[PDB]
Amino acid sequence: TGRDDTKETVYISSIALLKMLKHGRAGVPMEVMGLMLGEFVDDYTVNVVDVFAMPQSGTGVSVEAVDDVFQAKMMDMLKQTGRDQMVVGWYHSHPGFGCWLSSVDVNTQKSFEQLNSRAVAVVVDPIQSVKGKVVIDAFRLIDTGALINNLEPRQTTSNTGLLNKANIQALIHGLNRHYYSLNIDYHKTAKETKMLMNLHKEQWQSGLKMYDYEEKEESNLAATKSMVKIAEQYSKRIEEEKELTEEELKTRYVGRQDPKKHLSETADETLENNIVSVLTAGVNSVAIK
Template identity: 70%
Template sequence: MEVMGLMLGEFVDEYTVRVVDVFAMPQSGTGVSVEAVDHVFQTNMLDMLKQTGRPEMVVGWYHSHPGFGCWLSGVDINTQQSFEALNQRAVAVVVDPIQSVKGKVVIDAFRLINPQTMMLGQEPRQTTSNLGHLNKPSIQALIHGLNRHYYSIAINYRKNELEEKMLLNLHKKKWTDGLTLKRFDTHSKTNEQTVQEMLNLAIKYNKAVQEEDELTPEKAGNCKCRKARCEKTP
């Protein structure tokens, strides 16, 4: 299930867009595209946010591609065109919650390429900052028009020293982990499985010893030779 919403923030300078908050829209989709934006809901939501101390303007929109990767479909491009018609610097953000794993968020920001600019052979992106970096595009994104109909924008996460330290320590192992008690039913089940495995190994060992005792001296010697060759083989 795809979800979408609008991003609130400000245009800091000619090259920087700062996003400070987002809110979800009632639209959803089951494929790789979502429905058009509900302008009535958007207007009402912005009015309510201003009453709560959120006077920022809409700087773009976001939506999810669960399991599909980060790129824009044909419907997404049309939606982005409507945003850029209101503001040329509007940004489209795509997030993949399925591919996002622990310690890594699969997210990308896009803006459309003017066809006239491409015909003149000009570069659509301009930047004077080395903050952040552009990720290597996936083949799927290139197939769906990346660097032909739209281009990727570098994303930088603003965080202070304390926030950065907290995030770095979030998934770190602590000395208290060794003192944490497991649930009794889980621990009991693990113990039963371990005992059963030991019992099976003991039965197999006794069976092997009995078979060796029943062998004649000649066959027992051949078995020992085969075992020795197996142990020497790397």
């Protein structure tokens, strides 16, 4: 038998993820890059412990814009701090385009694949990470010959995975003609969770701190008026709401957005807002003196 290649999932430590985002957005739209320091263990886990950035160029990515001289100095800096392991590949950030390897990027990747076969290329989209999703996808070159022999099915053996394809168009061209994409899981520790979830010093300063009570009166005025308009609209609707076919009523007597529903959202927000506010006043007034 030969060597069989099979699924992997690239686990981007919490550290690694922030650095790529920080370095990549900051340098966008000029292309950003850097090496991924980490370790491969297992046969299903690429674990990227850290990344750093290699110096930007206005030739963007190139095979000779990788720059090994800078790589070597950087490696010795990690060596003296006892953090060097194994460079597990390279990442680069396309600006506002999708995750797909460019033709040039294929040859950049071909170089790192010689040095370690388990090397990945991680393509980042930073201007698209300001949604509620962070858009990052991973690729790893597969032998052109292997694709001829139908060895893309080989890469999904021994699990159902979480297989899904987040992007096509240039992606599915490059997969077909070069690569096997990887899904992305995140590693983080229980320490790191607590660091991430904590984002305020005002955690204990937000139910003793209050907003000006003129602002609250303005808010109650605004809220009550809004629901007064929605009630007139509702009242026009509910003069009927009694004939056959719901859908006919929704058109005819506007139940376009349902003024019942609309009033419920508005009612509930200001009602909940006032209970906190009164409770803050009453805590401070009685407790402090």
